[PDB]
Amino acid sequence: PINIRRATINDIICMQNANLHNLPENYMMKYYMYHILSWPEASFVATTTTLDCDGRTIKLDPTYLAPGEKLVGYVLVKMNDDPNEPPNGHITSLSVMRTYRRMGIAENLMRQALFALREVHQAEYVSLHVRQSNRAALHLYRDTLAFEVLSIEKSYYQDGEDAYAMKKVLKLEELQISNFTHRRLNEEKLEDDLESDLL
């Protein structure tokens, strides 16, 4: 299966590799350190798992965070550093593997990031940029993540492509993860209440 947890410094080496195999903007290891040591509760990663039912050691693969653990995706989040406004977050980079589409990994990683951005850092909103050509990205941020498109930012990337400056106001009540655990409504919305026994 795929596990989703917070990111640590022991994840950034494999994160760089994931970015070098997927995204066009590449960063030095010093830049990942500046992210995970400035905002150590914001970034999230998606990995594989090998739960015990023998054992094994780690494979000498650039994708192995631990024995039986393979990085498939990540989200690199940060607050705004540049110098005069309310607190606001920023998705620096997001990558999910091609073969791990159609599982909600991108959506699950972003929701944790948006919730952590509001709870930990009290961010009013979070901004990002999307390549206009990437239609699958526009459907993710805008249509499912309730982001809103603002400007067009013609020729924003170094290659010459026009970005999609998007922003989303953050309210802890709406960002609650327990809000998007069901799909087909109507039906009974059964959820945990943290009081009754499970046995």
Add this chain to the structure above:
Amino acid sequence: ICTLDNVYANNLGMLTKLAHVTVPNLYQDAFFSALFFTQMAYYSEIPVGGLVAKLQIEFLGVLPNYRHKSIGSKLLKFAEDKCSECHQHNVFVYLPAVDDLTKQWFIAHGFEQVGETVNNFIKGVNGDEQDAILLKKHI
């Protein structure tokens, strides 16, 4: 379901694959290595049909396991509108003489015959002669 976008000479190999898959001997490899009217049919991220035109239907193919779901003809309508919007009323296509099944049902759209076999219109991949048939429509 069954959407259509452009080629964009980044995924030209997509098109070249669908032309080299369905009826490929004739389909030269220097053909698509020039282009950069192109249009491809998508079936939920799955490229399924292709279309290359000249101004004429130079190629129209669809994957055999996704045919008859109205999909090839959708590419046909894209070619008609293209003609209608280039101030001309002549859409034509050259077909092999042995290709009868991609005729009777394929000529369901007004596409009348110009008159018998042409002989050796084009050489395929091997290099032998290939009898051809010309049918055409009007906008």
Add this chain to the structure above:
Amino acid sequence: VDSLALKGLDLYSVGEKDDAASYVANAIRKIESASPICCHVLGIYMRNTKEYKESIKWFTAALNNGSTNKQIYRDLATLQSQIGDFKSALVSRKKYWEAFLGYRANWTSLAVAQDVNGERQQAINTLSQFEKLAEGKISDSEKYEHSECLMYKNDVMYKAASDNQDKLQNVLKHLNDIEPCVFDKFGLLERKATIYMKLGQLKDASIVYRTLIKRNPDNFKYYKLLEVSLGIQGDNKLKKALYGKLEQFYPRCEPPKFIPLTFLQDKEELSKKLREYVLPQLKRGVPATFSNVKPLYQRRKSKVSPLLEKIVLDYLSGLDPTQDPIPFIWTNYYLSQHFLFLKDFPKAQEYIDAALDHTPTLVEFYILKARILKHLGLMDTAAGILEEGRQLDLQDRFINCKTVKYFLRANNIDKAVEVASLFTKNDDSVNGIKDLHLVEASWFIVEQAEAYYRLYLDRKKKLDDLESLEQIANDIKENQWLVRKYKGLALKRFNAIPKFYKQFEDDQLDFHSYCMRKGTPRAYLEMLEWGKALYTKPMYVRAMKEASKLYFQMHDDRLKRKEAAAMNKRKETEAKSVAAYPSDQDNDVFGEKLIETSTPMEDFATEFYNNYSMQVREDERDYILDFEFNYRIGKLALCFASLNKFAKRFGTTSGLFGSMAIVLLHATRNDTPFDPILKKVVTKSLEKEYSENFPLNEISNNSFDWLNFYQEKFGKNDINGLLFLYRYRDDVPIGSSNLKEMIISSLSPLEPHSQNEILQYYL
């Protein structure tokens, strides 16, 4: 003398590193006792050239010669923490802390210094003292830093409470007092549930583990941790009801649908959930369906391999490749991987072929077909299948890298380099080799270095087998160079990896001050642990282990002695395509000086091994590499040590153990070139714990056949153990011709890919 010093600094800052160091090296000969503003300048220079140990002395001398700048204490604290001298860094923190009491960062710095010095109590007192001084004066900007320093104070107290329930109660009180000011709710909740478990209040811990799951139901950790809090850790009949009741709160999350597959033992019911987890996926055609269920194929294959085979096969049996094409092609894609994992290659090709000829438009089908071909031994075919897949979309950066990998694995370094150059930032260059080194692309340089080592061994045999009987001579001069050229690049690319990971160790320099001002001491302590493991990461040890083959050989060949230049245009122009670093920084473009070294063992030690050995732990220490290294440097008393430590763990039944002992036991002879003192010690040690394992007395008997002993003691099947002996056939002759043939006859159970490489390279 202060003029010769600052010039180098000003000189260094522009870019002329050459005379920058040349100037400074006279300014220190001059004095032998300088001005403080001169010691400050050179301390700033040694820091920039990463000479930390010397920078500290020029910064310590700056103050010793009378300085007023109290920032030298912070500059000394950052530098001293970098070299691990935290005993001396605490002194610097105390001094800078006293100098600027108004800044909270200097309190956190002093505390962190005390925390790592074992002064856990002084750290808590330090943070508490500031807490009490700043009561009711924490502004909104300072609320994050305040939240971190409280969670950090709870971290120290919790590690100092150990398992004392009397104290574990007080750390629990502090955590609930600071909670309103703590914004790391995940970490606070994670901490609280650990105390409740250490406090035995498992009912209270179960409530936190349930709250954590609600905050992230996609986290497998909290689910199984909750089981231990409930005690149902070994009750599949109560675990089935647990996750069934969690399957309703979180019906999209996989932990409730997957964890049952790790303990259910009733075929009928286990097969029900197996059907509920992989069939909806094949319905949606999710390509990772098998990759999500593959862990079961490894931990409990025997009870999950055949029941999934029936479920998926029957599912596909009622599928229409017209009608239901998406689930049809993605169920063949699953079944192809299902049989490939079972090494049923005929069926593995059987189910990928259909999906391909049915839908030859999804690049996933190409990777899997190319993956089966590489298992069959057709590297050049598999690489071709992948270049077809990348032709479908030249923008896919993922298929390019997978394609670049397959071309490097087939030794097609020329196709590989230029497929990769489509996504690199070349600019005023030719290809993307210099760009791949800039972005620290270890995935490429390791795969390319291993390819160069394969190409070196291939052209080496082409040199020997053609030298064995005009142009058939200047053609030898071309291959005589290709072998030296591939060996150098193979070693020059391997040496590019320690350059990356020492940069990762220098990259933590700025964070000794920054993490304090940002108020992230807990994440900073995780960085110190990360820096102490950099030389143990998989990519670093992969380069080290692979590069040892070259260094160890260069020593082993060192044992028995190992119209003129009008072709340099071939070399000078080809040096433009293999360059890795700027010309202003590297002159050994072909690694020519790396392969012609006269101290191969000390080069491997100071470039790979020393930094690894000093950081690796016994748990994950490579003992075979330890043996092979100390054997070539004389330390026999470390060879039996590795063999003993390797023995502690792997049973005396391993064929690798037996080979290591036989090679070492043979070095305890009087005709061997080792120190007779170590020989006597290793002999004693061999008797003390392995007298009941090998006929030690028969090492002097020159007529004892050790191969026959191995055969009867470890079999003729332990491929790795036979290959270890064959490596040391020159030092331990035991019938190389008979050993080679027996290795070849043991290759029958291996797959064709592993057989080919053992025959083509290992022999």
